[PDB]
Amino acid sequence: PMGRDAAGQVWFTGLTNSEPGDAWYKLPRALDTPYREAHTRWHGCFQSRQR
Amino acid sequence: AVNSAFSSRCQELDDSLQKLQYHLRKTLTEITDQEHQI
């Protein structure tokens, strides 16, 4: 908030408070998985080209 | 010259910290007195 209120909380840039790794025991994919496709889908082709 | 500059900077930071604790102690004292007064 710009004005009478201002709070200096630190929002987390989610990259380590998650389990992006996949396995057959992880495929249930609970709806709380922070799985924005942005990095993950991009990570797919990124590692594919890097290989 | 790199090493010299680094030493100067860290010493300045230490001075700042000293100032901060100097303030905190009397802050606590004033809070206690104000509570006594309220």
């Binding site: 908030p1 009478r4 929002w11 840039t13 942005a38 991009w42 080209r49 | -």
Partner: protein, 145 residues
């Protein structure tokens, strides 16, 4: 392939910007009804009115970077696409000399991608805070009703 990464990225940004557009418009309507309530607690409405008004500027404040990101990236696309269509025996192919062992660049691709994500991640987080801010008003309004 690099250009395809950009087109993929801009579509995400193109999408991401669009939600706050409607989010802001709905938030504006919430404001007008409140000043009607002023014309129609009274300390509480004006306090929340200021609270909601301060959020209004913050939303467009959050936009600032996104248009800045959209603007400068597509300028590079001009360079990339021209380089993409840079061809042998073309017109502009000429013998410049000297600038081969030159580098002053701050980019490791995955870093660039996340900085784009960081701007996005802050953005919709603000949008959610906008939605909840609306909800308290009507409940307060109904309580005020």
């Amino acid at each position: 392939e690099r250009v395809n990464d950009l087109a993929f990225w801009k579509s995400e940004i193109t999408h991401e910007l669009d939600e706050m557009i409607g989010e802001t418009n709905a938030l504006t309507d919430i404001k007008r009804r409140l000043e009607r309530g002023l014309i129609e607690c009274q300390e509480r409405m004006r306090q929340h009115l200021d609270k909601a008004n301060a959020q209004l500027a913050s939303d467009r404040s959050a936009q600032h970077e996104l248009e800045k990101d959209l603007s400068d990236k597509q300028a590079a696309l001009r360079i990339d696409d021209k380089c993409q269509h840079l061809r042998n025996t073309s017109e502009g192919v000429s013998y410049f000399r000297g600038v081969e062992r030159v580098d002053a660049t701050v980019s490791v691709p995955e870093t660039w991608a996340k900085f784009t994500d960081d701007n996005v991640l802050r953005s919709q987080s603000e949008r959610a805070a906008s939605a909840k801010l609306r909800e308290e008003t009507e409940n307060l309004l109904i309580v005020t009703a």
